[PDB]
Amino acid sequence: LPKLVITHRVHEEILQLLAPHCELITNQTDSTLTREEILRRCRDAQAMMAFMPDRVDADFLQACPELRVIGCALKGFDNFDVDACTARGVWLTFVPDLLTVPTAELAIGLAVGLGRHLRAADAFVRSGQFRGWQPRFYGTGLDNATVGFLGMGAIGLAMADRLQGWGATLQYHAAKALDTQTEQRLGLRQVACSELFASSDFILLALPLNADTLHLVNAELLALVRPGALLVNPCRGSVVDEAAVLAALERGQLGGYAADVFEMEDWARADRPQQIDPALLAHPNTLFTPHIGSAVRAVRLEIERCAAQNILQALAGERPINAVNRLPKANP
Amino acid sequence: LPKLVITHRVHEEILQLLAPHCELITNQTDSTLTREEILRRCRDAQAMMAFMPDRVDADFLQACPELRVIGCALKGFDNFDVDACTARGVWLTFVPDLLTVPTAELAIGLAVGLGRHLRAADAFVRSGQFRGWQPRFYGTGLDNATVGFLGMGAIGLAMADRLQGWGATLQYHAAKALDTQTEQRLGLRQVACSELFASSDFILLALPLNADTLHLVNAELLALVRPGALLVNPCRGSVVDEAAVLAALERGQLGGYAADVFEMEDWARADRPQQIDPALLAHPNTLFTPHIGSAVRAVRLEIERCAAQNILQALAGERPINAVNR
Numbered sequence: 001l002p003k004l005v006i007t008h009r010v011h012e013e014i015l016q017l018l019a020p021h022c023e024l025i026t027n028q029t030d031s032t033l034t035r036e037e038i039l040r041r042c043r044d045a046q047a048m049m050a051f052m053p054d055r056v057d058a059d060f061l062q063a064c065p066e067l068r069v070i071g072c073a074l075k076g077f078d079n080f081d082v083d084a085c086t087a088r089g090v091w092l093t094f095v096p097d098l099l100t101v102p103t104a105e106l107a108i109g110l111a112v113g114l115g116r117h118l119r120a121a122d123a124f125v126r127s128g129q130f131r132g133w134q135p136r137f138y139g140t141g142l143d144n145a146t147v148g149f150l151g152m153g154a155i156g157l158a159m160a161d162r163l164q165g166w167g168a169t170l171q172y173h174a175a176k177a178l179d180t181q182t183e184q185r186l187g188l189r190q191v192a193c194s195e196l197f198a199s200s201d202f203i204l205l206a207l208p209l210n211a212d213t214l215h216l217v218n219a220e221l222l223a224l225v226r227p228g229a230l231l232v233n234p235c236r237g238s239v240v241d242e243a244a245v246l247a248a249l250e251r252g253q254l255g256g257y258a259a260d261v262f263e264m265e266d267w268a269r270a271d272r273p274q275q276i277d278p279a280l281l282a283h284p285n286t287l288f289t290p291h292i293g294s295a296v297r298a299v300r301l302e303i304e305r306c307a308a309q310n311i312l313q314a315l316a317g318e319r320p321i322n323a324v325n326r327l328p329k330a331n332p
Numbered sequence: 333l334p335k336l337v338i339t340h341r342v343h344e345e346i347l348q349l350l351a352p353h354c355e356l357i358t359n360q361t362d363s364t365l366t367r368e369e370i371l372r373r374c375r376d377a378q379a380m381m382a383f384m385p386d387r388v389d390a391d392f393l394q395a396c397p398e399l400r401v402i403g404c405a406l407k408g409f410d411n412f413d414v415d416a417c418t419a420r421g422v423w424l425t426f427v428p429d430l431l432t433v434p435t436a437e438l439a440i441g442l443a444v445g446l447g448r449h450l451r452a453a454d455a456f457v458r459s460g461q462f463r464g465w466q467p468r469f470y471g472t473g474l475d476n477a478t479v480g481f482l483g484m485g486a487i488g489l490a491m492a493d494r495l496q497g498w499g500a501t502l503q504y505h506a507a508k509a510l511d512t513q514t515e516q517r518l519g520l521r522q523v524a525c526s527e528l529f530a531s532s533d534f535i536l537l538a539l540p541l542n543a544d545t546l547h548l549v550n551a552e553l554l555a556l557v558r559p560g561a562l563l564v565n566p567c568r569g570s571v572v573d574e575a576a577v578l579a580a581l582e583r584g585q586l587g588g589y590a591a592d593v594f595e596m597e598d599w600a601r602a603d604r605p606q607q608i609d610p611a612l613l614a615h616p617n618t619l620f621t622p623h624i625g626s627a628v629r630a631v632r633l634e635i636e637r638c639a640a641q642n643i644l645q646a647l648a649g650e651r652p653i654n655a656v657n658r
């Protein structure tokens with residue numbers, strides 16, 4: 001009986017898991033519906049499965065008073081007002097682990113593609129003009145490089161594991177230090193944010209988007225980079241000031257920027273750019289992907305399953321395993 | 333000062349190291365000059381620093397009787413008649429293996445780029461049409477995949493090393509098998525050529541080119557492949573049959589092909605293709621690189637430096653460290 005709205009397309013097997021417990025109102029197409037259309041569907045929904053284009057604020061919740069649970073098919077719930085969910089007695093749940101590994105893979109791929117001029121290399125061969133080896137496309141590889149992680153959580157760790165054996169010197173700065181056991185095991189040295197940006201050949205971002213991280217990578221910080229340094233962003237766009245990244249690119253201090261994420265995606269920002277600057281889109285020392293960190297079908301299936309288990313738990317009157325927040329529940 | 337012709341562009345610092353010992357006739361441009369032109373340059377040269385696009389046969393050597401050293405900024409001598417060099421008392425020089433590692437880095441970059449549709453994804457956002465996350469561009473990860481190496485010398489090992497931590501299942505076929513200790517270390521399962529192609533999600537090539545290896549990856553073998561299998565060629569072009577790969581791509585059994593090397597490059601074969609098929613070139617499930625395996629700045633510098641020192645040693649009258657002959 002309880003209505004559940006699902007804002008984007010999910011695997012058949014997921015609908016089968018839910019269909020006995022809920023009234024599914026699904027978006028089994030390839031499109032992102034309108035803000036006003038999801039509001040209408042959610043108006044008396046007991047439940048919601050949310051995805052990356054979703055944004056949930058106190059305004060949204062006011063118009064949807066039957067909501068008991070919002071199940072997020074994602075890790076970074078920055079576009080979801082958790083306090084306001086709590087104020088309305090709505091569970092919010094996320095997916096803590098399943099997005100990690102394929103995002104870590106993409107990022108290393110970006111680091112390699114960016115450092116080796118893959119976009120133009122490939123464009124060149126595709127132009128038909130290839131005739132053999134030339135003294136051209138000399139790049140930056142991982143061997144002997146200083147690699148710097150900003151952040152050292154799930155993707156931080158999964159990337160460092162993936163770079164064991166690459167002959168790089170690994171260093172990091174994070175809100176919380178890793179125990180000495182993990183540092184020695186992964187070859188990781190802890191350094192300050194300033195030192196990270198001044199010494200690293202590659203700088204890989206692995207931070208969530210919050211108030212302390214908004215525009216953390218800025219002109220002051222980019223002004224510090226060794227000339228030609230490569231910056232890689234698989235996490236959230238507004239951890240970076242995209243305009244200062246452009247400027248470091250044009251002056252040739254920053255060697256390259258790769259990103260899977262963009263400022264324009266951060267819906268909880270009133271003042272978000274409405275687009276990626278065409279000038280960064282067209283800069284040659286770049287490589288981009290459309291938020292496909294977790295775009296592997298087998299993985300997406302499990303992300304959906306995790307979200308569905310959470311939603312179903314919540315509707316069964318239990319505390320969901322991946323609740324980010326806390327509601328009153330009866331004791332023994 | 334003995335005269336030295338540098339066949340292609342080097343870093344300023346190789347010039348600076350060499351000027352005080354050699355008259356330098358350089359080619360500080362992007363172009364590889366015609367062999368007529370390199371022959372003109374080398375008529376009375378004492379030394380030559382050669383690169384990948386150079387070929388040296390008896391005929392070349394006949395036209396250059398004052399040549400003492402060929403110092404090569406490369407490692408394979410397919411393009412080089414070694415016995416001609418020695419017959420005419422010319423040192424033929426190689427560099428140590430600085431090339432394997434950056435090539436292995438690129439190879440994994442390619443497998444990831446190919447599996448995750450990097451070219452198409454990049455173009456999509458550069459188009460300015462990106463409106464945030466969509467449930468498409470689904471791709472293939474390495475995690476839980478089976479990756480099969482065809483071959484396992486220096487390149488096979490470099491790549492296997494770099495794939496520890498990636499949670500894939502590793503397997504290989506090679507003429508020269510690995511010792512048990514390393515198989516153990518690397519989680520590497522040894523299989524037959526047929527089983528490798530039948531059970532690999534990614535197949536990464538690590539083979540030399542020779543008679544036994546010519547068109548090894550042919551239609552019969554590709555026909556065994558799992559639907560959507562991803563093939564990566566960073567080793568040599570002519571170990572695969574590009575027509576057979578294209579054909580495999582077009583029917584959709586092979587999910588993708590990435591290469592840094594192409595048949596048109598293999599100048600030993602008389603029957604070699606004259607370019608890369610434009611329909612392969614135009615295929616969406618590809619990813620290509622213009623033989624940039626070792627195109628890392630630090631490495632190219634060290635490569636030229638080793639070439640230079642071999643040349644200097646030969647001239648001052650010593651046996652060069654990396655002499656391939658005598």
Ligand SMILES: NC(=O)c1ccc[n+]([C@@H]2O[C@H](COP(=O)([O-])OP(=O)(O)OC[C@H]3O[C@@H](n4cnc5c(N)ncnc54)[C@H](O)[C@@H]3O)[C@@H](O)[C@H]2O)c1
Pocket residue numbers: 075076077096099100103150151152153154155156173174175176206207208209212213234235236260261291292293294
């Ligand atoms: N591209 C994608 O598709 C994709 C996929 C998954 C996650 N992400 C994003 O990447 C982010 C990180 O993912 P995760 O799974 O590793 O998250 P996580 O919560 O496991 O780790 C976050 C880490 O950042 C650190 N941190 C927080 N504030 C910091 C600060 N001010 N300075 C330095 N370090 C700080 C924390 O100590 C923690 O170690 C997610 O929050 C999400 O926003 C993107």
